[PDB]
Amino acid sequence: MKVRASVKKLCRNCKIVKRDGVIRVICSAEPKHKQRQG
Amino acid sequence: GSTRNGRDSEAKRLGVKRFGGESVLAGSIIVRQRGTKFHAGANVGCGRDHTLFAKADGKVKFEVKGPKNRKFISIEAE
């Protein structure tokens, strides 16, 4: 998991989702792309 | 360290002493100046330091005259 102030789609398979007040990036293709804003 | 500056001269209190329309006695200084920013008109003299002073009693009058659009000071007899 990457924890950053700037979270973005890194590839066409990344998806932005907000879970319990936290913006996250979840990617079906690449575990390295998983992010949470913080 | 230290500074190479720190000098100045005393202020000379130049400028206009009597403005347009003011009644003055002969001898009154009207303007103190370096060089002739203002020029002497009727009933006004120009001193050695280019002071303009009244040569007659009357009212101060400023005007722009001549081919160079120069500013002249004169005294209107009252």
Binding site: - | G1, S2, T3, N5
Partner: protein, 136 residues
Amino acid sequence: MLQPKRTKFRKMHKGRNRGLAQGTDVSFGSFGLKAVGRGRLTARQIEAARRAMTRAVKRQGKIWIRVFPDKPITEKPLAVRMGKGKGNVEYWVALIQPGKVLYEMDGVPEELAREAFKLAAAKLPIKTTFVTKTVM
């Protein structure tokens, strides 16, 4: 790093930075990066943004810098007390007011100019906006 080749005087009063800018139109190219905020642009910042711009367009087209850092900035060295004269000139800045066009570009597609200007704006301390030439 831009800097006047010579100046009448070495040091300058702090001054202030009020008002809106002059030079608010794209005047030389077709696209511009315009300042929205107010501030100072150091010569290092102007150059860091120029480099990022220029590498993004692969040194194609043409680039104008509409601002020049002509104001010297002094600093007092560390562990020095107040007084004993004005400090030494350390860097140069340009004063920026809202509306100032900072850079202009020509000879590239608009989509590429937008991307190049975005990379440059990330080097600058002031908020900016992308503008295009207008006929009037």
